[PDB]
Amino acid sequence: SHPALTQLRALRYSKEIPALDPQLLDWLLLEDSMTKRFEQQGKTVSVTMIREGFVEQNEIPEELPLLPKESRYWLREILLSADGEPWLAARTVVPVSTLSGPELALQKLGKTPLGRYLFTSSTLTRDFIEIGRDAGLWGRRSRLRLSGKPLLLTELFLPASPLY
Numbered sequence: 001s002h003p004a005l006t007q008l009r010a011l012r013y014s015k016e017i018p019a020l021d022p023q024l025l026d027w028l029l030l031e032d033s034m035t036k037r038f039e040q041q042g043k044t045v046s047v048t049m050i051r052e053g054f055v056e057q058n059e060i061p062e063e064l065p066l067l068p069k070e071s072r073y074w075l076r077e078i079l080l081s082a083d084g085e086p087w088l089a090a091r092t093v094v095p096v097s098t099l100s101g102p103e104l105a106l107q108k109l110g111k112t113p114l115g116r117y118l119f120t121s122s123t124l125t126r127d128f129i130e131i132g133r134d135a136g137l138w139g140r141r142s143r144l145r146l147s148g149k150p151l152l153l154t155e156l157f158l159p160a161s162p163l164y
């Protein structure tokens with residue numbers, strides 16, 4: 001596990017998106033993962049794997065209300081670094097029914113960071129996003145659909161990141 005993932009799981013969300021300055025909203029509402037956006041800053045991005053594998057409902061209490069109830073889910077928790085400096089922690093939960101067809105690849109991603117560049121085959125949409133916060137830090141959670149199949153993606157922005 002990891003202190004940053006512990007922090008990510010403590011974020012508290014608002015049903016309504018706050019009226020933040022537009023520079024900060026550009027970042028939080030971005031329709032993609034942070035990969036290319038961070039590279040844009042003049043950085044090399046790398047992933048540290050914290051935890052990966054199949055888990056049962058009891059391991060995903062925060063996400064369960066937002067996804068289909070199934071026997072198993074694929075869990076992916078990472079730390080994203082920019083030139084060696086941690087900038088983000090992320091937690092992705094995929095119901096196993098979403099793992100079919102091209103989407104089965106979500107399972108073999110490893111240390112490659114997630115991004116729209118990887119799913120050119122599938123159709124991508126987001127039906128919900130909320131902004132959260134904890135102890136001065138910003139986070140967000142989104143339900144994305146690949147070819148109609150859902151997954152939940154949560155991101156915590158570390159203070160080293162450009163949002164601050």
Ligand SMILES: COc1cc(C(=O)[O-])ccc1O
Pocket residue numbers: 030031032033114115116124125126142144153
């Ligand atoms: C938030 O992460 C993403 C968002 C969206 C989106 O919101 O449409 C698409 C792909 C992503 O990897």
Ligand SMILES: COc1cc(C(=O)[O-])ccc1O
Pocket residue numbers: 032033034035036047076078080090091092112113114115153155
């Ligand atoms: C680089 O940005 C992201 C990567 C991942 C990942 O690889 O699981 C998740 C959320 C992100 O914003």
